[PDB]
Amino acid sequence: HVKSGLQIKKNAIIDDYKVTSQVLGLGINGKVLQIFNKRTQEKFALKMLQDCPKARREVELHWRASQCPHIVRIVDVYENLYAGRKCLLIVMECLDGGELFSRIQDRGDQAFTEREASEIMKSIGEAIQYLHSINIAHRDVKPENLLYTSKRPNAILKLTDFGFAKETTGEKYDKSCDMWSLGVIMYILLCGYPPFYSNHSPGMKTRIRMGQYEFPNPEWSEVSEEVKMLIRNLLKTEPTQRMTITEFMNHPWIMQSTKVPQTPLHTSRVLKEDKERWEDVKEEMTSALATMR
Incomplete structure (x- = not known):
């Protein structure tokens, strides 16, 4: 075609x-x-x-x-x-519905489920799957570049900003950094904070201490091992061992979003408690991506 x-x-x-x-x-x-x-x-x-x-x-x-x-x-x-x-x-096309996580944080009931996270991750995985299938790596998949069509609850999430996008060749691992981005976004959707160590930030909670197990208990206790395994695959240190978009979109958690439990998550409530740190979250994702692309 x-x-x-x-x-x-x-x-x-x-x-x-x-x-x-x-x-x-x-x-x-x-x-x-x-x-x-x-x-x-x-x-x-x-x-x-x-x-x-x-x-x-x-x-x-x-x-x-x-x-x-x-x-x-x-x-x-x-x-x-x-x-x-x-x-x-x-x-x-105008995207008037704001950034992905802004919507989640501003919810009035502070309620958000595993199923919703799965649905969102499927949307983002579809865009990445298209790009990687025509040998493009986006290389700037992050919160400010994921936007909703309108303010309404059934608005479509879309990927923007090709300022770091690049043609690839397969034997290449340029696509790896998009898979890491998915793991990070997924992680935040499930708990409200990124899987980042920091040496930080007062009148606030430290969510992950340095060197600490990456799935801490208050927020991660009701989340299945299956889902934690999917995340470890996306965040794997070595690009040679990191999950590909084919494996990701073929995983039951993504393929069958409808059958995903409506586990209630801490996400929205945590995004609000930690909203003074949001700028730093984005800043750390941006810095990490620049060392990783």
């Missing part, structure tokens, strides 16, 4: 979409902005990149991935002049 290649349009974007240029001001800094199609009136999102080799690759790899339903769609790409600089203006 044959798919079209990426046509980068050269006409000014404002022929096609309403923007106005105090909106564009905040854009070249990095913020995704809201814009409207003129013909259709549908809302979209706009990312502004400086045109270089690397931005070109990001947009290329992302375009190949767009038709995955667990990956944010590229609608159009423009090569325009903005300010003194040549820019890639990328038009995408």
Whole structure:
């Protein structure tokens, strides 16, 4: 089966979409902005990149991935002049529902089940499975890059931000770092904190002491050994021994999310207790990923 290649349009974007240029001001800094199609009136999102080799690759790899339903769609790409600089203006579907874990943390009943975690992990695994099956590694799978279509409870989770994405060759282990990311996200979904040692952070709990067993008791006591084994496989130190996306998506815990117990988890309640640490969680995931990609 044959798919079209990426046509980068050269006409000014404002022929096609309403923007106005105090909106564009905040854009070249990095913020995704809201814009409207003129013909259709549908809302979209706009990312502004400086045109270089690397931005070109990001947009290329992302375009190949767009038709995955667990990956944010590229609608159009423009090569325009903005300010003194040549820019890639990328038009995408708007994802208005916020980040994955924000939703979980803000729940009013502080209730979250193993089954829900499984359902979410299936969504993320589908996007990764698509990428790895066309020899792309994302290499920046992390909380801020997983976003919901809308605020509503049945919104679709989607993967964004191809700024670190890369073509691979199989004999390669570039894909390994995506599998580690899955293990980390899964771990947080099940307990509310990452599987990170720290030498930290007052008026707060230390969730995992250095060198301590990785599944501590208050939060992990009702979680099966089967699930802990799936996590050890995803987090395995050596990339040569780390679980692949094929093994992950073929695991019963993922394949049969419907049959997963509705075990009540500490996740939402822990995300709230520890919300002052969330910035540091993300910061540590970002640093780890940079040593691991």
